Design a protein around this ligand. Structure first.
Ligand SMILES: Nc1nc2[nH]c(CCCCc3csc(C(=O)N[C@@H](CCC(=O)O)C(=O)O)c3)cc2c(=O)[nH]1
Ligand SMILES: NCC(=O)N[C@@H]1O[C@H](COP(=O)([O-])[O-])[C@@H](O)[C@H]1O
Length: 200
């Protein structure tokens, strides 16, 4: 299966996917990395790995639908089967999500359905949980509400900050995102017609 990875930043999840998809038994190959932001470290990681990159600046488009259409053009250019959102921080439009239904995965740094949104660690810390974690899910139109593929729990330590908690949770992200991508690329897991996850 041919994979696009979309990023907005550092790209540690991208790097874990590059490493995993290059193992001999990988059912996935990364053929393009797309960033909505220029000069982010994730682009360096892609280029060093010899993977093509495109920057599609969302600021340059009239609305969400036109931005998504620009992304979609590149996905078609590279005959992409599966999209991974790896630190990509834009909400996607309904028609784009619908087109890629069952083919697009996101990593989120909480145990969904807790702490949906763009500041999950801040929420976890404010709430005072002692266990958080991360989630890989299929992307649905409602943000962070799509069908869950894998999750991993991560303890919150007393005195944690966003810096220390995000560091600990990223170690788990780098485990489950490669595992989830392999499950979907191998056809082991799919989004069922009834909308629920199907292990074949
Ligand atoms: N339809 C849909 N789009 C998705 N995009 C992502 C990817 C993960 C999204 C996380 C996220 C949660 S809220 C937010 C946000 O408000 N973004 C802003 C801009 C944020 C920024 O640029 O810094 C926006 O899009 O206007 C970003 C996941 C996901 C999803 O499940 N469904
Ligand atoms: N999807 C919402 C969200 O908060 N995503 C989070 O952004 C970070 C990106 O790090 P990276 O650029 O090093 O992969 C990751 O922790 C990811 O779970």
């Amino acid at each position: 299966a041919r994979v696009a990875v979309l990023i907005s930043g550092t790209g540690s999840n991208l790097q874990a996917l590059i490493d995993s998809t290059r193992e001999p038994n990988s059912s996935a190959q990364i053929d393009i990395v797309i960033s909505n932001k220029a000069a982010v470290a994730g682009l360096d990681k892609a280029e060093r790995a010899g993977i093509p990159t495109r920057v599609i600046n969302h600021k340059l488009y009239k609305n969400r639908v036109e931005f998504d259409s620009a992304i979609d053009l590149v996905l078609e250019e590279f005959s992409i089967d599966i999209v991974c959102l790896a630190g990509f921080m834009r909400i996607l439009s309904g028609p784009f999500v619908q087109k890629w239904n069952g083919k697009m995965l996101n990593i989120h740094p909480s145990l969904l359905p807790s702490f949906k949104g763009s500041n999950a660690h801040e929420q976890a810390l404010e709430t005072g949980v002692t266990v958080t974690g991360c989630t890989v899910h299929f992307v649905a139109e409602d943000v962070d509400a799509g069908q869950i593929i894998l999750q991993e729990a991560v303890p919150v330590k007393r005195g944690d900050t966003v810096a220390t908690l995000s560091e600990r949770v990223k170690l788990a992200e780098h485990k489950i995102f490669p595992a989830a991508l392999q499950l979907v690329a191998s056809g082991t897991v799919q989004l069922g017609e009834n909308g629920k996850i199907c292990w074949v």
